[PDB]
Amino acid sequence: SLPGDFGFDPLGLLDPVNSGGFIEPKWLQYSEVIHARWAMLGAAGCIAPEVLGAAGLIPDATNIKWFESGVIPPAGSYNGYWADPYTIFFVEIVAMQFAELRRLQDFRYPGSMGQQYFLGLEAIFKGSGDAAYPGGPFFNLFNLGKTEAAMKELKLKEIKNGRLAMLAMLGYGAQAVMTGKGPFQNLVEHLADPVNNNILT
Amino acid sequence: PLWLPGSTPPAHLKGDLPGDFGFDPLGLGANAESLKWFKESELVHSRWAMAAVAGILVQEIDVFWYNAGKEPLGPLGLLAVEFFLMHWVEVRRWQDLRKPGSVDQDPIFSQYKLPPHEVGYPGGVFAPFIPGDLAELKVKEIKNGRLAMLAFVGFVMAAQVTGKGPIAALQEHLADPWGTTIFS
Amino acid sequence: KLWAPGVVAPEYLKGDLAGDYGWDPLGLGADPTALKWYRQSELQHARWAMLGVAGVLVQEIVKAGLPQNLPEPFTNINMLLAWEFILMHWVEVRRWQDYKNFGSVNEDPIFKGNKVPNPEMGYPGGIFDPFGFSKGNLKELQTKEIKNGRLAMIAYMAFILQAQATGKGPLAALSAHLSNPFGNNILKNIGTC
Amino acid sequence: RPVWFPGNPPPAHLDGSLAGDYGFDPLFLGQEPQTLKWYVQAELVHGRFAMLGAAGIILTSIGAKVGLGFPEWYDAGKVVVEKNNIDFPTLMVIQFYLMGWAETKRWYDFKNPGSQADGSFLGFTEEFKGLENGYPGGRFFDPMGLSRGDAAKYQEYKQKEVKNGRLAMIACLGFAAQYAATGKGPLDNLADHLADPNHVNFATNGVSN
Numbered sequence A: 001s002l003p004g005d006f007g008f009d010p011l012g013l014l015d016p017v018n019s020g021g022f023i024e025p026k027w028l029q030y031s032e033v034i035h036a037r038w039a040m041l042g043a044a045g046c047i048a049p050e051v052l053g054a055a056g057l058i059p060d061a062t063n064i065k066w067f068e069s070g071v072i073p074p075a076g077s078y079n080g081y082w083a084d085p086y087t088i089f090f091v092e093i094v095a096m097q098f099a100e101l102r103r104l105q106d107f108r109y110p111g112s113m114g115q116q117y118f119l120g121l122e123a124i125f126k127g128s129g130d131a132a133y134p135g136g137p138f139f140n141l142f143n144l145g146k147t148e149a150a151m152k153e154l155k156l157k158e159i160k161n162g163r164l165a166m167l168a169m170l171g172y173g174a175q176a177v178m179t180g181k182g183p184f185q186n187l188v189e190h191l192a193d194p195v196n197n198n199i200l201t
Numbered sequence B: 001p002l003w004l005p006g007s008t009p010p011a012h013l014k015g016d017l018p019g020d021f022g023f024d025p026l027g028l029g030a031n032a033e034s035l036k037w038f039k040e041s042e043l044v045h046s047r048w049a050m051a052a053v054a055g056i057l058v059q060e061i062d063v064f065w066y067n068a069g070k071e072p073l074g075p076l077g078l079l080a081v082e083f084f085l086m087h088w089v090e091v092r093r094w095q096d097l098r099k100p101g102s103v104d105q106d107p108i109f110s111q112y113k114l115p116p117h118e119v120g121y122p123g124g125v126f127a128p129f130i131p132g133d134l135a136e137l138k139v140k141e142i143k144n145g146r147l148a149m150l151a152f153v154g155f156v157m158a159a160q161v162t163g164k165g166p167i168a169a170l171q172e173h174l175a176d177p178w179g180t181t182i183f184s
Numbered sequence C: 001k002l003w004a005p006g007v008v009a010p011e012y013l014k015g016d017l018a019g020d021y022g023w024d025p026l027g028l029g030a031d032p033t034a035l036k037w038y039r040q041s042e043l044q045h046a047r048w049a050m051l052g053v054a055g056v057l058v059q060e061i062v063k064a065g066l067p068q069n070l071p072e073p074f075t076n077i078n079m080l081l082a083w084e085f086i087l088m089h090w091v092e093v094r095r096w097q098d099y100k101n102f103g104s105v106n107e108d109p110i111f112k113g114n115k116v117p118n119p120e121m122g123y124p125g126g127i128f129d130p131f132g133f134s135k136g137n138l139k140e141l142q143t144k145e146i147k148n149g150r151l152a153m154i155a156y157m158a159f160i161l162q163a164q165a166t167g168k169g170p171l172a173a174l175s176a177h178l179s180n181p182f183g184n185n186i187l188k189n190i191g192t193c
Numbered sequence D: 001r002p003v004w005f006p007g008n009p010p011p012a013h014l015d016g017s018l019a020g021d022y023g024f025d026p027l028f029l030g031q032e033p034q035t036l037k038w039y040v041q042a043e044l045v046h047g048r049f050a051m052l053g054a055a056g057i058i059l060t061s062i063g064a065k066v067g068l069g070f071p072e073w074y075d076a077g078k079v080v081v082e083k084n085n086i087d088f089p090t091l092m093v094i095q096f097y098l099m100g101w102a103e104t105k106r107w108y109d110f111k112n113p114g115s116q117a118d119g120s121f122l123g124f125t126e127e128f129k130g131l132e133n134g135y136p137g138g139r140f141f142d143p144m145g146l147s148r149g150d151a152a153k154y155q156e157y158k159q160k161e162v163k164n165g166r167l168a169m170i171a172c173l174g175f176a177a178q179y180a181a182t183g184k185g186p187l188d189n190l191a192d193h194l195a196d197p198n199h200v201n202f203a204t205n206g207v208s209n
């Protein structure tokens, strides 16, 4: 019934007999998807400057590696920002508090977020019975997957780009600790001398 | 007839009183006890303001009305004859509220009595000329009244900002309208 | 019609409205009291923005440029926001009650014979329409009001993020590409005040 | 109806009948109805003292930040005491008598609806009635008689009053945790933040607090 089912569970997690807590079918399909959606943001978001900068669109300052942005101060922090990294992290917490807890309240109560006023948006945030796939004019402006078949296939398309982008992030990290360079400088140096620029070296 | 045309007046204001233009954002006139009191303070307040703003102008048609405080019978000598005369008079008006008719009769010369009358509009002695007619006058009274009340706070903030009185502050405004506002 | 192929419009956006296009993906018009106010505001934006974009370039052609404003137009200094604050207060609040109460404020407070005709709310007519444009294509014109409007609003939002990034009046911003297109873009002006 | 934590339904013991009732007692404190009747007065008075206090700082502080005369709220007790003739111990004791009297009478209205109403005082009978736990009214407590005006007009103010109450209580404690973390006045804390808001935050000096 879940999309991305190619039958891969050595560890009997999704087995619904005597389930409890966070080892719940409804729950994990959710995680994987939200995981997928974030992972694809990170994958395309980590590289883009290193690429676009090298491409010569982005100035000399901005064109940094992913771990040199000021997330991990000791690996490098940026300067040229609207503010310091901590006056940001607060603007983050308030926002992600709102926009993650709301999303939790659709999971917890389907109908909720539809009733209690929220600057006109309460009309929007009704849900879709299914949690992972809310839609409505906010989160599906183009009304794509107009049929049940075309939707199920788009749900197939989503999870696979995701799972790939999650491994890609497991990539960029495990890669950055051993190399100490960004996964686009690793790629171009690997085009130049495939056997010299390698794990084994 | 309304302070803000197209408004509905509040429920308690029904156009019975003189200068009821449907105005009580904070339902001040909500309870009949309080609205009976507030009626008086709004007469008397204007009556004192009309009397005073009439004064300020005509006394300066000179010197600063504000520093008139500095003027033949000592200070405490004069503050007494005010206190007793004002205490006398104000108590007697305040009885007419305490009970609507309680006072009307000349305690000395009890031959002379003030005829039955609406509160705060006493007449008899106090309406000799019996001038212009019926309520309309009471509506000039409260209008001309409020304008006088406002003008006074004007006259005060006009003093406490320019230094000059009213007619000079105007002559100053005429000289440089674009310049002599609060916004400069 | 509509705003995107493959989307269904919402049940409040019937098409009754001059420039309906099933465009509200944040729910905001789903309240019917909000949809009456917002559309006064959207009218109100448009109808400035169109004086607003006109004003820019008709005085850009007869002289960044707009952003700068202080002593220059035969005024050493004259201090003024009095005239605006009182009249624009006077005026707007008369609109205020004509939303607050559809009909109340269609008549002259002083010379009570005079009277703006029963419009639609925000389409006052009478003296606000003295070239006898009452009748004809009422709603076709209203589709022109909003669509020239909505351009002008994004035209002005445009002129400004120009007038900052570059510091150029948006004719002189145009005619800085007429010369050097590939080397004079957003991409070279993300950049700067 | 609107709630503190949208979606999560409000707990039974909250009706939507009391002013500022947003289904918020996550710790089951005010469950037994008497023990909540008690807290709806604590909250009101707390908020009324907090409002007077916040209005009390917010005016002195601009008065000090408008002309170099008035003292900062922190070091403005000694400035009142030293400069003027008066002593601390007596004020603190005078206060306790008047506040003692004022409270000890409210004290015996919580447990007894219309207790002090009996005229057993200065013949003042009708002024010290019950009415509604938290709003005593009459010629003294509600002179103008908004209490005895209209049903809706008064209901809306209960709403206004508790909210302002809760905002002033927050406001007040900021004043108290802002002098602490930065050692300055609340229109020096406000001027410094308007001139350079991105940098002058807590992030600078004011820690987790």
Ligand SMILES: CC(/C=C/C=C(C)/C=C/[C@@]12O[C@]1(C)C[C@@H](O)CC2(C)C)=C\C=C\C=C(C)\C=C\C=C(C)\C=C\[C@@]12O[C@]1(C)C[C@@H](O)CC2(C)C
Pocket: C023, C024, C025, C026, C027, C028, C044, C045, C046, C048, C049, C051, C052, C053, C055, C056, C065, C066, C067, C069, C153, C154, C156, C157
């Ligand atoms: C009025 C206006 C500008 C007015 C400017 C004026 C008077 C200019 C005056 C002057 O120039 C002169 C003449 C001469 C100069 O010397 C001085 C200045 C002072 C410079 C701009 C509006 C500008 C208005 C803009 C840009 C508004 C855009 C709104 C949008 C896009 C909203 C869209 C949506 O709301 C919907 C419809 C539905 C939802 O579901 C989804 C979202 C997306 C939220």
Ligand SMILES: CC(/C=C/C=C(C)/C=C/[C@@]12O[C@]1(C)C[C@@H](O)CC2(C)C)=C\C=C\C=C(C)\C=C\C=C(C)\C=C\[C@@]12O[C@]1(C)C[C@@H](O)CC2(C)C
Pocket: D024, D025, D026, D027, D028, D029, D046, D047, D049, D050, D052, D053, D054, D056, D057, D060, D072, D073, D074, D076, D077, D168, D169, D170, D172, D173
């Ligand atoms: C914030 C506050 C109290 C907060 C309490 C909260 C949040 C309670 C919340 C909860 O219980 C609920 C509802 C439900 C539970 O399930 C959970 C919790 C979360 C437990 C009170 C502040 C209250 C603040 C007050 C009363 C301050 C007033 C100050 C006074 C009176 C006088 C002082 C001054 O005079 C000086 C000394 C010098 C002058 O210069 C200046 C002034 C300031 C004027």
Ligand SMILES: CC1=C[C@H](O)CC(C)(C)[C@H]1/C=C/C(C)=C/C=C/C(C)=C/C=C/C=C(C)/C=C/C=C(C)/C=C/C1=C(C)C[C@H](O)CC1(C)C
Pocket: A008, A009, A010, A011, A012, A013, A034, A035, A036, A038, A039, A040, A041, A042, A043, A045, A046, A065, A066, A067, A068, A069, A070, A071, A166, A167, A169, A170
């Ligand atoms: C399923 C199963 C089944 C069976 O039964 C068993 C087994 C097999 C065991 C299991 C498991 C599997 C696995 C391995 C999984 C994995 C996952 C992952 C990795 C995820 C990620 C995931 C991931 C993710 C989300 C991520 C994200 C990220 C991001 C956003 C980023 C961001 C950023 C950026 C841009 C930039 C800056 O500067 C930095 C940062 C800030 C950093």
Ligand SMILES: CC1=C[C@H](O)CC(C)(C)[C@H]1/C=C/C(C)=C/C=C/C(C)=C/C=C/C=C(C)/C=C/C=C(C)/C=C/C1=C(C)C[C@H](O)CC1(C)C
Pocket: A040, A041, A043, A044, A139, A140, A141, A142, A143, A144, A161, A162, A164, A165, A167, A168, A169, A171, A172, A175, A183, A184, A186, A187
């Ligand atoms: C919802 C909605 C709604 C409406 O209706 C419509 C619309 C709007 C359309 C929609 C939206 C959408 C979106 C947002 C999307 C997104 C996407 C993405 C971003 C993806 C990525 C995605 C991504 C991905 C996969 C990624 C991947 C990656 C990879 C493999 C990597 C690789 C690598 C590695 C490791 C290492 C080395 O050394 C380098 C490299 C070689 C580089």
